[PDB]
Design a protein around this ligand. Structure first.
Ligand SMILES: *Cc1c(COP(=O)(O)O)cnc(C)c1O
Ligand SMILES: *Cc1c(COP(=O)(O)O)cnc(C)c1O
Ligand SMILES: *Cc1c(COP(=O)(O)O)cnc(C)c1O
Ligand SMILES: *Cc1c(COP(=O)(O)O)cnc(C)c1O
Lengths: 450, 454, 454, 454
């Protein structure tokens, strides 16, 4: 009668008084028995509190807030498979409208057949990899036409995000990164050209450098590639990594010439889940036209009496993010995106101005729309010692729940330490004012505790 | 006044009487102005009905239902970034626990340092590419150890899913796919050996072929690779693509030796969102140990005072799916998964038995746990003409919302047409009985209208 | 022009693109204009994230989790007024049942008229003040029965919670607080008697000391008061402040004689929202009988053709907490409470055991049901220097969201520094294991960074 | 087999078919066993229907409705502790903002340090007690400076709410209440002065008398006190009990000089949960400056590197109401509050006009913003006999679920019976029209049944 005794408790026991919640969760072997669903949920729900608060995570570029309709659309699409174009046909059609809209946003040549060349991805990483493969294949064909070897490809770039290093390693391409150096934390024309040769598959300007928040302007680089071809005969194209900038500049700094308005840009990628306002799991890559995308890389699938071209690394995945993306496009439009991005820039500019009053800092980024993304990036003025480092300050801020990263730059600037604050949607003026309060309090604490 | 009058309507108009819903949604250019959020949601919500009913989609292998707690965990984790190990450390800790559990499920050698070698992925596609890259690299090392050229790698396999064709194309590897042929819809030992040579980076058995639903058993192939090494000195590894079988066999057919219990299996991949019961966006790949994974492919990141290795093609992505996976592991356990998979096999066998009574069919898969996944796959018996093709039957069933695919096999079986029914979680016996009723009705309709044949 | 376009934006603008959310919230004067309700809610909701996580708050004794039915009862009762007995008759009746239940739990003499003498309160503070007032009044009557002056009352006690200092100040009573001494962090019989005299209105044993988590046992003190009356003729009563212990001992240590089983105990108070499992806003005070509560302090009100006495400092307040309490009483009962409290002690004992293996500590409280509440309290062994102070450790833990207090004891132990961990409902074993991991990581960091010392 | 059979039933039985719901709820002793949570919730949920529909309760002054955002905010803050300023620092910050806003609303001298002197409370009762203690303490210091006894304090007031009778009893203060009398149901200057002497700790004018709904105007009384000091040298201050009026006059009758604009007003208290639109559990008390609040009554606590003074009777309690109060302040502003209050006054004025047409009534309050609160209070004209009493009418209305109190006034007006209708937020015009319809029906019934009179 022991079995019956324990079963009775298993039925009537409360959530925290239950035997199944009296032990530490399994972390080594596959669990043997099934257990009360409420206890299983409670345990995991509580463990997740150790992740901290996403709204206070100021180190990330990804969306940490979504409105009610996106929550509903995501829940409604939880089981809609993005890859099954024939089984989820309307989801696929929506995806295609987004491709057209993004292509239009980036000034891609108007599609004669009514459909821009491009695709949704899980994020910029996959988007950049697809962009890199196409870049590699176009180069191979160029060299084959020239009768030259194709076994030593290289890629020229500036302070790229880690996905490009992974591309380099996984696709055996030599990465020629122009290192940052004091006063020049990016790839300038001169050093770019110095790294280019006939084995260069392309150049990748980062329209919104992660480490600094500033844009690498493609035009001056584009001018240098034109000169290079006129001098050497070598014709190099560009892929713009606009993970962040792709959904900012079009709305707040439309005159910046960085997209398909530039002849050598054959493809551009961006993260919908960054400033594109979509929930985690949405990326985009667009090609200027069909000739920029080698067909050998596209796998066609049947779609409504015909066949659509697919180019992806992943296969099955949720279609909720693209649906959410389309919702934002329709609900906000250019007008809405401008208002939302302007709100971010206002907050970045505010913090930039206020923080400048509190210490001997030299800013790298101050939330200016014509210079980069809505972020504040600074370092202590060389030789200035206020009695603390940005690492200590970063730590004091974390005591209040904020994640504000302090880190060293790369290349020839490794001796420089910077602090970066990202101002995304959902980091409203009032909320950022609280951060300013904790910053002042942290400084005051560091001054009284040397 | 016109302006204020229009604004008054914009504020007071009902959902369907509003001016903003009187037009066709944009599909060509980025929208110019903002609009009422309720109208935007409504328009899209309604368009999505044209996707049909996923619960009636019997063509997919992916989860079409999730319990309430998973819905809650997914909603709570909508903004948790899987890649940010330092910013979302407990999500990272949970993911690592799942790696251990899946590695354990597949009999991987127990990790001496407490952490198995492997990673979560968006799905089996990424998992397979990671496994494939590791294979190419290990092969290169093997060849370079003997001073031989590595310019012509090839991969030997059977009727694989399209992701392996993509792998071959993207990574410049020659795919040597042994084709299907009547009576042998898989990669048999004899033909496998024929295709293998010094340039083979590895063999990929499909533990659960999509086309037929049957398992390609790794053991007999393993025995062949042993003899192959004895005769030629060529040592070939295996990567098991257990996209479906990975979360089935361990529960309902433990006696099948297909995993790390086999020495040549250096890695295994499977889809959590298929029979792993996780929501779309979850896959797994495990390596038997440190030596099976080239560190040159791993990018280390800072994590709680130390470092964690990362091998992934994607970067930022939601952590909800892996959190949901862990919940299923904890809530169900071996006992629970066994009961859920048992229910699927019950239905598959029911339908296989019932449908057999309705026509001149030859079954390729009958939902037997010892032969493959919970699926029903059959063709019309050679030479018989019931007055209809499976294509016609498929179309009739679609009139009632069901998506039951009818298709021709590949290789040397391109003239054979099969119909496949997938029995996933959420396709309970009662629901399946309704399908059977529609099947019977479709058959009576086809018999009354002999012209539909063709 | 401007007014119209502005209103359009006000109507169509999204949450964060709205002009109204472009500024800092008002904090000095009453706002002049009305604003979008979604923006007002959003701003406040977001500000509240700076409060941190209540579940990781290990400093509080109050409930930080409530089940769904309680969330529902509270929402349904948001506007039910506890004081209006005639207007909310059944809420009143339920409250009265709770009084009988708590009185029963504490062994109060069975009430002849079917209703125990006592009342619900906002918390132990008001309850203690009511008990203190009755105490002062009974003392006055005793003194007046012999024609003696009542201008110099004093109250004898040990390491009491701040509410007794407030009672002493507000009601002009001299608080004779026996200070903590190393090895004697409580009011012992000998010192209690030294402080007692004819002007003592009562003795207040703290059955669950906040600073240490240990029980001050009323039995030994009661024996001392018996001897004291025998020796001096002075008869002194007790009021037990069982804010925490009143909802612990009855379930996990029934043999401790601390309640109305002791003749001199004329009243007992406790916090429902502490270990009574009620949501914030519920306290209790019970008197052993009619004679223990001076009628002059009670205000009778009409109630269903009759009258019931009321004794409270507050007037209008929500009835939800007492309704929630009754639900917990009925849903859990003695069996359920015993299981929830056992879970807390299990966790406290766990942490006590594991933390001991991490440093030169001397424990004051180790989560033993026979010595006190479910808490872990410790200090560094005298003379030992592990390279850090508990203050530094507390600070490191806060980096992970945990609020674990480190503070000096009072009295003659102001030189001692302790760290106290509260183990409440909702601080399950798995969650506590995460804290332990953070403790281990903090210690390693502190060992790698000596400068942090002090 | 019996134990297992009944267990199966406990699992499968429906809500009302379960054995656990087959008995009467416990009401005498602490429950022994734990029971199904759904049955426990159901039983209590159902018992609560016996309370009156709060929306139809026209006797209460407290909020009987709150918007959706307040419900959400309250649910989110169910466990935030108002007292732990250091553990819930932002909740504390928001509270202080409210203190500033309320002080500003009442014209308190602008705080030089940026923070007004005052505090949030559970309701007006605690606020008034805090206000009273401060008056008592200031008086004592005045007397001690004069070298006069402080053992016979008294307080002068008009028809105050019961909380002042409690203050008087609990703090041993002699209450000198000026009684109501025909013609003047309040404290007039002449009779106030006649009760004042050197032992008077202060005067408490009620800015919104509960019994009548009319305001007691502080100005003429303040004038009398100035003259009294000039004639006797006795300096007496005031504390305004603006429980209701505090959140009315500022918005709809700005010109009434009743607040800090008056020199003798050293403190004011009001109920946030009455016309302040906050949910039950919120009150306020503001002091004109630091000098008006004796420091010996404040207990300072650590707050963000500094210290914040606290003065409260309760300790732990929910922070949800203050957060909700701040939300209302921000969402409505002076514009929003004026609209909501104007709404109540329009409804009260409507009922007053309509009810006057139905019988021989003499109105004491007709919902005029310059005279008092949004209420209707009347009596039968002296001598007139319509064939019923207001008690009978009150009873007929209760048959329709309405709670409309009928009661006798106090003092020298005990022979006067009045009926009072409270028009709160949420008692919209349409709703009140239904009441008017029932009032007419009750009258027609009382006329058709003459023997009901009495
Ligand atoms: C964040 C980022 C990426 C990676 O994009 P995901 O969306 O995280 O995959 C790539 N490039 C740049 C410049 C980035 O900022
Ligand atoms: C479905 C499937 C895949 C692809 O897996 P995803 O989760 O869709 O990426 C790969 N291999 C096999 C055998 C499959 O069935
Ligand atoms: C917490 C506590 C109090 C105060 O009770 P509240 O519920 O916070 O008003 C009083 N006494 C003791 C011993 C306590 O622990
Ligand atoms: C209602 C009222 C009180 C009591 O205030 P609570 O908020 O109910 O505690 C005190 N004075 C007056 C004049 C009142 O109307």
């Amino acid at each position: 009668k022991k079995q019956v005794t324990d079963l009775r408790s298993e039925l009537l026991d409360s959530r925290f008084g239950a035997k199944s919640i009296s032990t530490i969760a399994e972390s080594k072997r596959f669990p043997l028995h099934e257990m009360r669903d409420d206890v299983a949920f409670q345990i995991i729900n509580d463990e997740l509190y150790l992740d901290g608060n996403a709204r206070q995570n100021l180190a990330t570029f990804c969306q940490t807030w979504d409105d009610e309709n996106v929550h509903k659309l995501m829940d409604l699409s939880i089981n809609k498979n993005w890859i099954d174009k024939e089984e989820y046909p309307q989801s696929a059609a929506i995806d295609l409208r987004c491709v057209n809209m993004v292509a239009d946003l980036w000034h891609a040549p108007a599609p004669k057949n009514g459909q821009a060349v491009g695709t949704n991805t899980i994020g910029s990483s996959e988007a950049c990899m697809l962009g890199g493969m196409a870049m590699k294949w176009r180069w191979r064909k160029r060299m084959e036409a020239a009768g030259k070897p194709t076994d030593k490809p290289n890629l020229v770039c500036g302070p790229v995000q880690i996905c490009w290093h992974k591309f380099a390693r996984y696709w055996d391409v030599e990465l020629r990164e122009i290192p940052m150096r004091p006063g020049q934390l990016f790839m300038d024309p001169k050093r770019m050209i110095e790294a280019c040769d006939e084995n260069t598959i392309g150049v990748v300007p980062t329209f919104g450098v992660t480490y600094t928040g500033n844009y690498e302007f493609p035009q001056p680089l584009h001018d240098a590639l034109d000169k290079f071809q006129a001098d050497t005969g070598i014709d190099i194209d560009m892929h713009i990594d606009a993970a962040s900038g792709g959904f900012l500049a079009p709305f707040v700094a439309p005159d910046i010439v960085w997209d398909f308005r530039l002849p050598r840009v054959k493809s551009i990628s961006a993260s919908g889940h960054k400033f594109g306002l979509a929930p985690l799991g949405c990326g985009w890559v667009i090609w200027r036209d069909e000739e920029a995308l080698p067909q050998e890389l596209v796998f066609n699938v049947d779609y409504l009496g015909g066949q659509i071209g697919t180019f992806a690394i992943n296969f099955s995945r949720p279609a909720g993010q693209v649906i959410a993306q389309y919702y934002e496009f329709l609900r906000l439009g250019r007008e809405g995106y401008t208002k939302v991005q302007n709100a971010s820039y206002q907050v970045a500019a505010y913090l930039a101005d206020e923080i400048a009053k509190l210490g001997p800092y030299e800013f790298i980024c101050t939330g200016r729309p014509d210079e980069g993304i809505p972020a504040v990036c600074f370092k202590l003025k060389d030789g200035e010692d206020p009695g603390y480092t940005l690492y200590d300050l970063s730590e004091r801020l974390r005591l209040r729940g904020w994640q504000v990263p302090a880190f060293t730059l790369g290349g020839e600037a490794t001796d420089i330490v910077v602090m970066r604050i990202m101002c995304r949607r959902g980091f409203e003026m009032d909320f950022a004012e609280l951060l300013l309060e904790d910053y002042k309090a942290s400084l005051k604490y560091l001054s009284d505790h040397p």
